[PDB]
Symmetry: C2
Subunit: 264 residues, 2 copies
């Protein structure tokens, strides 16, 4: 089935992984309107060597959940968090030997912002296992480099399809919150629509200014579309970018939603 | 057909376009190494409304060639330039109504740097048609968001093909000069090869750390590849990016290169 599709997470031998996210949830504009200030997206990209510290992966994954993942509620934040812990498969105790935290998250309301500010006073810079510190950074901004695929898919349950056209466009936003408020919500409203005056103006805004004229014929010939909004976070240091491994794309299965069996 | 392929957006109605570039030339590392001064990529993104000035599109294109395109020689610069002129299709003289210049270029030698400084002295801020000014800007740096397509094209004379896999990876470079020295030259040496010990380590370096193992099966099943290195120029102001329509991609026509009729 179609809509948001999360990309598969990184696989590693002898590693326990926990993944926490509510990014699959459609943005709620009535909730997001309760935030009146711009606030930077939070970035965690932390790792450390645990060899010899006599920790179990359970000790590690649960110390991280008490000081981070459980402090970030799905009803105050949109988040996508990835916690990894490596262990030594030959050690009789199979003690942990490393860990990493990867996360980005946004407060959704002014109350969440207030809670967030007090969370950072208490836990930003927290000492993790006397090896590294929980560092929650401000993203300076985010560049979306978005790919659009249009074409004809013979079997909707398998991945190959015939590619008709491909386009790219790039946008700067202040935070992932804004990306969800402006781009993601528009995707749900107008990318999944067979109303010409919804989807073709959608292409004009996000693909290029007359993509609607180009795509009318293509949309009529096609039955399958994809939007890959790659999120390139820009950090304060020059040349420092962050692209999380937690990726998603939008699949539009026109052959199953429209009577036409096509995208227009 | 094979190699670097320029891909400008579909041409807008009633517009004349002149395109100038020597980006198609393979980089020669022994020549690029002779330049000792880093110089930032030069950026032109200039436009203006000409309605009513009684200029011919020829007047416009020839004035821009005299003050810009002919001052940027291919043996001192790699450049990619797009000069467009909109005209009034119903005016009996079809007078020009707007124009734009899109360009990036890099000096290739220390002498070119000196000559470039001479040109900016003389021509930066030049008055174009009493409407706008010729401005050459320094890019702060460049984010390459590179796409790889792999699949099967039955008819090499046409655009459709069956898409097997898609991947993106993102890198920061200080300049387009560095992009040609590090990325583009690697493309010519190893992307266009059916040697597993050439192409797959190329994939490990530029796609993701183990892409060679994933794509080994895929490359044998495929006969067609494309590399779309989108160049997102980072300008000096915060949130200011420039992505030209001066796009190119690399097509790998395995069904025509290889005895296998396939990419491996």
């Amino acid at each position: 089935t179609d809509g948001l599709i999360f990309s598969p997470l990184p696989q590693n031998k002898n590693t326990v992984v926990r993944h926490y996210s509510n990014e699959q949830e459609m943005p709620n504009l009535s909730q997001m309107a309760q935030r009146t200030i711009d606030f930077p997206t939070q970035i965690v990209r932390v790792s450390g060597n645990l060899t010899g510290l006599e920790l179990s992966c359970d000790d590690v994954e649960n110390e991280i959940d008490q000081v981070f993942s459980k402090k970030i509620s799905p009803n105050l934040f949109t988040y996508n968090t990835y916690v990894s812990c490596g262990y030594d498969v030959n050690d009789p105790e199979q003690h942990a030997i490393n860990f990493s935290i990867q996360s980005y998250f946004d407060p959704l309301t002014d109350n969440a912002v207030d809670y967030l500010k007090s969370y950072l006073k208490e836990y930003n810079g927290y000492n993790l296992f006397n090896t590294t510190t929980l560092q929650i950074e401000n993203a300076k901004g985010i560049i979306v480099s978005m790919n659009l695929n249009a074409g004809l898919k013979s079997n909707p349950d398998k991945t190959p399809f015939t590619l008709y056209r491909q386009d790219r466009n790039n946008f700067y936003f202040k935070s992932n919150f804004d990306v969800r408020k402006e781009l993601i919500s528009d995707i749900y409203q107008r990318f999944y629509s067979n109303d010409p005056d919804m989807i073709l103006p959608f292409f004009d805004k996000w693909i290029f200014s007359y993509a609607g004229s180009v795509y009318y014929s293509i949309l009529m010939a096609s039955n399958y579309l994809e939007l890959q909004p790659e999120r390139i976070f820009v950090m304060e240091n020059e040349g420092d970018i962050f692209v999380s491994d937690l990726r998603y794309y939008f699949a539009n299965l026109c052959m199953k939603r429209n009577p036409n069996k096509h995208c227009l």
